[PDB]
Amino acid sequence: IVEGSDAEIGMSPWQVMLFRKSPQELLCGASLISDRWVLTAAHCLLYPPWDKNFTENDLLVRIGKHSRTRYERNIEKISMLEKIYIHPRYNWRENLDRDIALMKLKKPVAFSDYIHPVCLPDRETAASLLQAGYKGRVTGWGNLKETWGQPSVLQVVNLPIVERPVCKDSTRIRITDNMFCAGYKPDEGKRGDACEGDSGGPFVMKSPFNNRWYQMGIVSWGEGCDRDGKYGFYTHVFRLKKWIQKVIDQF
C-alpha cells in the first residue's frame, strides 16, 4: 500500500495473509468470508506466463495479523488449505478477467477480536455503493513504493471508485464488467494505491444503511503503483457471486 497509513488493531479482522512455506514469504492478501472459506485473486495462485501455479500444500493462510513479519503469538491463527478453487473462466491470457479464487480451510478458524468475516454484497448493496466518487478501503502488507520499502504493520488507504470511461482511458488493457477501478485523479492531490504484495486483498465499503462492511472488490491489477493518471483495478465481487455461491453451495 502506497501513501497509506498504519491500520489500527482489529480494523480489518477479515484480512488474510497468504504465506509461502518455503521460502517463507508473503504471497498475497486475501479475505475471510466465513469460518472455513477465504477469498483471493486468481492471479495469486495461477499465472502461467510467469509459471505460477501454487498447490494447496505450497502455502498457509495467516488470519488475525497486524505485524507483517512477526509470528503473532496468541493472536494470529494459521490454517492449512484443503482445496483451491479458481474461476474456470479466469482470463490470465488477456486481461485478468474474472480474477477470483476461493480456498477452503482444513479446519474452521475460531473467531476472535482479531478474526472476523467480512460480508459479501447482494445486488442492491452493489447498486447502492458501487458509484463513482464513493470511497472504499484497501488493506495489505505490500510495498510502500513502486520501486526502491516494506511495512512493519498492516496498511490501509481509502480510495474513490472512478468513472468507467476514465478507467477505460487510463489503460490499453481491455476492461470488462467484472472489474472496476479506484483512485484519485491527478487534479485531486490526494494519493494512494495498492502495490506489489497487496494482490488478492479486499476492497471494502461500510454500508450506511446497516453499518456492516462489505467486500466489493479484490485487488487485481494496475500499472506500477500510485502513478499519476493510473488507477488500481479490482475484481467485481458481486458480479462473480453466482460463482462464489456455486462453489460454497457445492463444496
Binding site: F111, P160, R212
Partner: peptide, 27 residues
Amino acid sequence: ADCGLRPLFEKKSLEDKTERELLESYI
C-alpha cells in the same frame, strides 16, 4: 449473520480513524 461487524469497532460502538471519510463520500 454477524458478518461485517468488527468486535473492536462496530460491536462496541467505536469508530476507527477514517471510516467517516467513507461515510462522507456516500453522497
